[PDB]
Amino acid sequence: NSINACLAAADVEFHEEDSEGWDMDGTAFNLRVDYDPAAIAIPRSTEDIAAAVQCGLDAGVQISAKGGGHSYGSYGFGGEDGHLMLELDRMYRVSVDDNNVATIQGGARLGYTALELLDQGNRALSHGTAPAVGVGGHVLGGGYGFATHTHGLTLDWLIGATVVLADASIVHVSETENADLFWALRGGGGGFAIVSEFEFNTFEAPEIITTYQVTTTWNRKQHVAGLKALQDWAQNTMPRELSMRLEINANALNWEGNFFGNAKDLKKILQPIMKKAGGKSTISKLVETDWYGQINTYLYGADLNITYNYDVHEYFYANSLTAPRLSDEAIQAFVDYKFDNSSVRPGRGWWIQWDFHGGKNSALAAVSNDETAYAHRDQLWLWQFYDSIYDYENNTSPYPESGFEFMQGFVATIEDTLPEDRKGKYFNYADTTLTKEEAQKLYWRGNLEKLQAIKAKYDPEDVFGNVVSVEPIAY
Numbered sequence: 001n002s003i004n005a006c007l008a009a010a011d012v013e014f015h016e017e018d019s020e021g022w023d024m025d026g027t028a029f030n031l032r033v034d035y036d037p038a039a040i041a042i043p044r045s046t047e048d049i050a051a052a053v054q055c056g057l058d059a060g061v062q063i064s065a066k067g068g069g070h071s072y073g074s075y076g077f078g079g080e081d082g083h084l085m086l087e088l089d090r091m092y093r094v095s096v097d098d099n100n101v102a103t104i105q106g107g108a109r110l111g112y113t114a115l116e117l118l119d120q121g122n123r124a125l126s127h128g129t130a131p132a133v134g135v136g137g138h139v140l141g142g143g144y145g146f147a148t149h150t151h152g153l154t155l156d157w158l159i160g161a162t163v164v165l166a167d168a169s170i171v172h173v174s175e176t177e178n179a180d181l182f183w184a185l186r187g188g189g190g191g192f193a194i195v196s197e198f199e200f201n202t203f204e205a206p207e208i209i210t211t212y213q214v215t216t217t218w219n220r221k222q223h224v225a226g227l228k229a230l231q232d233w234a235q236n237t238m239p240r241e242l243s244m245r246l247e248i249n250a251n252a253l254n255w256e257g258n259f260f261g262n263a264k265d266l267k268k269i270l271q272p273i274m275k276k277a278g279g280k281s282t283i284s285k286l287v288e289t290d291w292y293g294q295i296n297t298y299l300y301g302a303d304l305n306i307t308y309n310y311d312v313h314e315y316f317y318a319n320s321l322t323a324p325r326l327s328d329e330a331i332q333a334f335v336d337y338k339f340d341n342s343s344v345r346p347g348r349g350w351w352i353q354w355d356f357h358g359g360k361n362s363a364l365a366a367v368s369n370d371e372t373a374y375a376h377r378d379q380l381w382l383w384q385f386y387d388s389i390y391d392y393e394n395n396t397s398p399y400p401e402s403g404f405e406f407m408q409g410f411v412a413t414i415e416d417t418l419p420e421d422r423k424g425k426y427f428n429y430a431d432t433t434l435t436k437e438e439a440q441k442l443y444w445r446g447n448l449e450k451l452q453a454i455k456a457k458y459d460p461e462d463v464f465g466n467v468v469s470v471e472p473i474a475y
């Protein structure tokens with residue numbers, strides 16, 4: 001291997017293609033989109049990353065940084081075969097200084113990070129629920145979770161980073177240094193630079209968090225009336241201190257989330273909306289706990305402390321959508337689709353998450369679409385669509401040939417009713433069926449032009465590009 005020879009000469013560890021190491025790190029989380037990298041480097045330092053980049057340049061291949069490997073399109077591989085992969089999960093050091101600023105290496109995962117922040121000063125950060133998700137991909141695309149309505153996206157806490165550029169140079173980025181690249185890293189997704197270290201501000205772990213679940217027993221009509229009510233409430237009422245998402249599947253619709261406060265105050269907040277939503281619902285979960293407690297409430301069987309021994313996989317097709325307030329027609333269309341178009345074969349299953357993303361009191365929406373590369377600050381809603389194949393080891397049908405039409409149709413029920421400029425998707429919940437041109441518009445909407453200009457400046461040759469990433473286009 002020409003690249004492996006170069007890596008060896010630079011004293012950078014790499015995986016031989018016919019090795020157990022390769023079979024582990026070279027196999028994508030989503031087996032439906034598993035790719036074969038040209039090579040896999042395992043940097044242990046910023047200098048290692050720079051040396052690895054130089055090797056990829058010499059080889060003439062695109063280079064893809066892999067953080068936690070949880071992207072639905074396997075972008076840690078470049079979203080296709082043939083890229084030099086930089087497996088960063090051996091670089092996960094977390095260090096909190098005297099100013100409560102946390103320096104997190106680019107290969108750190110959410111669980112390990114949360115544990116370290118708690119151990120080093122009882123600190124916390126706003127991020128997703130899954131412990132295996134890499135901090136790198138998470139923050140570059142946003143970073144959404146049960147703390148977003150109260151504390152914003154993970155990227156809203158980023159204040160700096162040490163990165164390696166497409167020409168292998170090493171520089172520091174912040175609001176006062178290479179600020180244009182700093183802006184792009186906060187929401188621009190992949191392809192701008194390889195981050196060796198992220199620098200985050202943090203908040204003290206809250207004294208109390210009350211987790212909850214509301215279970216509904218709604219028919220078709222009650223789904224529409226309930227969602228319409230929830231929409232008005234999300235837009236104008238839902239408190240800054242409260243987060244909520246609806247777990248939707250073929251036979252249920254439940255509300256769940258965290259409250260930065262006690263159960264007494266939470267019941268008084270939920271009571272009014274449960275009534276306005278048409279009743280036919282009840283609180284099925286209500287527990288006061290702490291930061292560590294809430295984190296451990298949404299692991300879904302995953303190990304909390306994960307670093308470089310990771311070999312978990314699934315076989316699925318996901319999709320997403322962001323949107324403003326919806327018309328009754330849109331909601332009706334979505335509900336009808338659930339009731340009449342969601343039948344799947346045994347061994348296959350689906351679920352949807354309806355996230356209370358924006359809204360009057362959402363900390364996320366308190367930030368301008370111009371302040372960071374994140375371009376959905378004006379969107380009330382965020383959705384995650386998930387189509388799973390449970391018995392993929394025996395049967396993947398309709399995949400890989402088809403099956404996409406199911407969730408694409410589910411998205412369309414709502415998207416078709418939206419003005420073109422308000423149609424969007426969330427890069428962290430990627431839709432692999434998208435072309436590079438379609439993806440850029442949906443994922444970055446109004447900030448696409450600025451991002452393409454920044455991309456042209458820092459990576460004109462598109463060395464770090466993936467199949468749907470921001471293209472380099474000078475202004």
Ligand SMILES: *Cc1cc2c(cc1C)nc1c(=O)[nH]c(=O)nc-1n2C[C@H](O)[C@H](O)[C@H](O)COP(=O)(O)OP(=O)(O)OC[C@H]1O[C@@H](n2cnc3c(N)ncnc32)[C@H](O)[C@@H]1O
Nearest residue numbers: 067068069070071076106128130134136137144190195428
């Ligand atoms: C699998 C999964 C994903 C997920 C989740 C739960 C599971 C089980 N829960 C999420 C949640 O609650 N909220 C949210 O916003 N996202 C959630 N996700 C979605 C998605 O997987 C993550 O948000 C994130 O994008 C994954 O990051 P990860 O780091 O694991 O991904 P990757 O495939 O290796 O790379 C993703 C992309 O960004 C780049 N990247 C990653 N690290 C770096 C560094 N250090 N420097 C530069 N670029 C980096 C990749 O190159 C690629 O473009």
Ligand SMILES: *[C@@H]1O[C@H](CO)[C@@H](O[C@@H]2O[C@H](CO)[C@@H](O[C@@H]3O[C@H](CO)[C@@H](O)[C@H](O)[C@H]3NC(C)=O)[C@H](O)[C@H]2NC(C)=O)[C@H](O)[C@H]1NC(C)=O
Nearest residue numbers: 090092093111112113114115116119304305306307308309
């Ligand atoms: C989550 O899992 C991690 C392993 O995947 C654990 O990380 C280990 O933390 C140990 C300290 O808590 C480290 O021990 C240190 O090792 C160095 C050299 O290896 C010694 O010089 C230090 O003396 C020693 N620390 C002590 C006891 O003074 C391990 O090196 C480290 N392992 C790895 C591979 O990172 C996390 O601890 C674990 N999280 C928790 C605490 O639950």
Ligand SMILES: *[C@@H]1O[C@H](CO)[C@@H](O)[C@H](O)[C@H]1NC(C)=O
Nearest residue numbers: 336337339340341342409413
């Ligand atoms: C959904 O199912 C109905 C029948 O229940 C069918 O007529 C329709 O074509 C399917 N897809 C659409 C357009 O929603």
Ligand SMILES: [Zn+2]
Nearest residue numbers: 017036037038
């Ligand atoms: Zn190969």
